[model samples]
Target: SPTQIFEHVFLGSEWNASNLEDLQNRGVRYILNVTREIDNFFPGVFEYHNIRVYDEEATDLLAYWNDTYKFISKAKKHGSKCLVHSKMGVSRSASTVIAYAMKEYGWNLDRAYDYVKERRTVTKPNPSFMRQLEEYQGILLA
Candidate 1:
């Protein structure tokens, strides 16, 4: 299943990402696949931008936040929806979407986290990833 993060952004697993009917029903025109193993489901159909990172704690996901945000922002500008998904739709995907929430809503790490966590309920950023997001909160404000 997919969780709507905002009007133009969603979060989900690879299953949800690859399901065409669901994507069409949700109006997903772009995908920000956050993994190295999962290839784009339909590169010829939907616009895809891959982050190519692992869900490990030391993967340095923070470095990719701004670019992911840019991709999602572009989709937003075009009235196109973007789905962010990882292998499990839990950690890496969750963190990237949360980073977008933080920057887009002018929110702190905790509040933005609570917002997404309440919806997904399964979202879990790795320890190092969470640490980076906390640091990113200050970076966005600065």
Candidate 2:
């Protein structure tokens, strides 16, 4: 039922209670919001009683990945699903998804990208993000 190691982690821009309910109905129980501090899109958005929010500013790849790994660890410990988001749901969101997919699911670079494409078509992962993912892989394989 849960896909691979991480189950279902939604990558998107913004979501309302209905969307949160839909994901929660599907077993998603956590929301990993990667918006900046100045952005007013988070802090108290979803009304899903079972969901918990983890906010992190993804200004750089290393910071983002580190924070993301922590978020995923907490989610897994609680058997919670994650929903990640950015403004356009493309580079920032996709990069985070791909990174986590690679880390938790053991998906290769291209495969991770493809997996995200199957969900949301718009994805570049950014040149910097690709580099960071490679770094994460190297750290793991080392």
Candidate 3:
């Protein structure tokens, strides 16, 4: 299930091995994988960048905040649409996308979360991630 979160960004679940074509058809040229799993699913095809993170509340998603934002920024700079995903398209992936949104659009945590939620209703960035996002909000403001 892919949900468009921005003009050129989408959020989804694990890469459906059988639906790679569907993603290509939808203009996703870059993929940001947030889970522990990684692979070259499509050789010479879509660009893949992985920020391995466990989907646990204790995992500090904030550590990869700027780097992940840069990944999405680089993809968009190359005129590529990016799909950020984890195992379920709910927590880790959603937090990354929300962080990217904050960096790209100069939005606060609340605004960024609301913006992503508008597109993907099931998005939940978990308690620990949410606290980090608030801390990130302070960083952006500083």
Q: What is the TM-score of each candidate against the true structure?
A: 0.97, 0.69, 0.92
lDDT score, candidate 1, position 26: 88
lDDT tens digits, residues 1-142, model 3? 6888887788988854226887888888888888886554775788888878788888998999788888888777988788888888899989999988898889888898999988899999888988888888888888
Q: Model 1, 142: alpha-carbon shift in Å?
A: 2.9
lDDT of 3 at 9: 86
Backbone clash total, candidate 2: 0
**Please, what are the lDDT tens digits per residue for candidate 2 over residues 1-142?**
2222246466666542136456657666666655552143334543121112223233466555757867766766886766666555666667777887777778787788888777577766767667777787787668
- lDDT on C-alpha atoms for all candidate structures: 0.92, 0.60, 0.83
Question: In model 3, which runs have C-alpha deviations exceeding 4 angstroms?
Answer: 15-18, 38-40
Of 2 and 3, the candidate ahead on lDDT is 3
RMSD of 1: 0.8
Q: Which has the higher lDDT value, candidate number 1 or candidate number 3?
A: 1
Worst 10 residues of 2 by lDDT: 47-56
Off by over 4 Å in 1: none
Please give the lDDT score at residue 55 for candidate 2.
Answer: 32
Q: Output the TM-score of candidate 1.
A: 0.97
